[PDB]
Design a protein around this ligand. Sequence first.
Ligand code: HEM
Ligand code: HEM
Lengths: 117, 117
Amino acid sequence: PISIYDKIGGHEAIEVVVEDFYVRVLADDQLSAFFSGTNMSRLKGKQVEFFAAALGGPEPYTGAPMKQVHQGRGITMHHFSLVAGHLADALTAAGVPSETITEILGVIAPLAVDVTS
Amino acid sequence: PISIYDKIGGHEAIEVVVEDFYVRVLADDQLSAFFSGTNMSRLKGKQVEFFAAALGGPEPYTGAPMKQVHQGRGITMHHFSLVAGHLADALTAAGVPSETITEILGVIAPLAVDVTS
Ligand code: HEM
Ligand code: HEM
């Protein structure tokens, strides 16, 4: 078929989504402190890689596995819900059709919690 | 098309998956304490409803929204990963083809964290 990545506009679309996503995440006073020690330019690059790779683009994901990145930080299920919500909101802002937003959340969310099955 | 629910065997298949899922969840010493105060027979019924409804079956979900059920329990992102993993494992045990397991996790996981977009 066509990849989800291609369907939404390829690399540029991923960049747009990720930038808007991080605005929403870092604006959230329940989340922002988690990123106090983070190399943010590197993180955003890695997130573009993760999204692009997961949605079927040619970009390699060169980052770490999700469990090993996220563990030991005190991130709650509530925090995950907030993040997932900000992602859905960024895809909406970007103009992604709603059924494709659902598809993307369905690809990304399980991967974010180390399910690949 | 056909619903995911129909594709996997309808109501009976949901019942099989849910029973095996709860064996895995309650066997997990990191999760089992969360259910100490729970009406378990009612919960399993509600989970069958949730899965069946979410996968396109005729069964109404009569339970509560995910945020309102799960909040204030100290459930972590790690706990969610464990649960999602047990779900994938139950679908594998049940013999669901792997691409359909991926589809199901993609439907269920975002709903579990109150994303509908
Ligand atoms: C859909 C959900 C999520 C996805 C896809 C995701 C993905 C990623 C990726 C790709 C990285 C970069 C990994 C690397 O550098 O190798 C990362 C880092 C990070 N994530 Fe997430 N993540 C998610 C949810 C969360 C949540 C809920 C939190 C809670 C605040 C969070 C906090 C972090 C932090 C703090 C880092 C950076 C660690 C550091 O370099 O200092 N993430 N995530
Ligand atoms: C895919 C992930 C999940 C789904 C789809 C899910 C779904 C549900 C549903 C449908 C109920 C019943 C709601 C009602 O009675 O109205 C429920 C209750 C519950 N869930 Fe989850 N859940 C998920 C993840 C988790 C996780 C990660 C925990 C951590 C232990 C958890 C703990 C509970 C508990 C303790 C209850 C019962 C509250 C009670 O009646 O005493 N769930 N969940």
